[PDB]
Write a protein that binds this ligand. Structure first.
Ligand SMILES: Nc1ncnc2c1ncn2[C@@H]1O[C@H](COP(=O)(O)OP(=O)(O)OP(=O)(O)O)[C@@H](O)[C@H]1O
Ligand SMILES: [Mg+2]
Length: 149
DNA sequence: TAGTAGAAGTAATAGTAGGGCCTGTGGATTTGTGGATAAGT
């Protein structure tokens, strides 16, 4: 969890890249909770629920954006609860990002809130001056431009 | 043949006629009072 524009999607894209590079047989899936809900509901409407479960319960690593989007949605929260349960039971990896810690996500069931706190919860804070300059240096060097200090 | 469990929903107008009056200074205004003035005798 952390602020916006703070590096969470970068971090877990890096996780996916690392896992794919070191293990090519792994089925690493990354998406956003918005796309999760859209696919879930469309599968319900088109009788594709079995295929949705097949695609999402059997991934080796799962990466979720902005799980805050699930707040206020009951059935999608239940379906993600069951997906989490199946993946954790199969000893698979689940990575979740958010902008708020799970304690203060409204309209969240206590089972999901306790599952979120089960593992390790990490926070991102706004960068300071040295790392701002270092980030800009990295972007400038990757792009290929020379710019004064 | 006897048959299931289903969600996440928006950006919204134009709008009425209205009570006397108990009080109460401020100031015009419309005259009476007095003064100025022509005349005529
Ligand atoms: N050390 C760093 N820390 C944070 N951000 C960094 C760092 N180095 C580079 N960035 C850049 O920060 C930007 C922030 O975008 P990012 O996708 O990470 O946002 P976010 O806060 O995780 O949001 P979201 O989950 O909605 O995508 C990226 O474009 C990334 O390239
Ligand atoms: Mg992004």
């Amino acid at each position: 969890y952390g602020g916006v524009g703070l590096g969470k999607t970068h971090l877990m894209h890096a996780i996916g890249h690392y896992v794919i590079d070191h293990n090519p047989s792994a089925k690493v899936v990354y998406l956003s909770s918005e796309k999760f809900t859209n696919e879930f509901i469309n599968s319900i409407r088109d009788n594709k629920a079995v295929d949705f479960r097949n695609r999402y319960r059997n991934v080796d690593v799962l990466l979720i954006d902005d799980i805050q989007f699930l707040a206020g949605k009951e059935q999608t929260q239940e379906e993600f609860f069951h997906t989490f349960n199946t993946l954790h039971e199969e000893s698979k990896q689940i990575v979740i990002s958010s902008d708020r810690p799970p304690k203060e996500i409204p309209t969240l069931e206590d089972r999901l809130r306790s599952r979120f706190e089960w593992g390790l919860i990490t926070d991102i804070t706004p960068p300071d001056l040295e790392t701002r300059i270092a980030i800009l240096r990295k972007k400038a060097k990757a792009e290929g431009l020379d710019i004064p200090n």
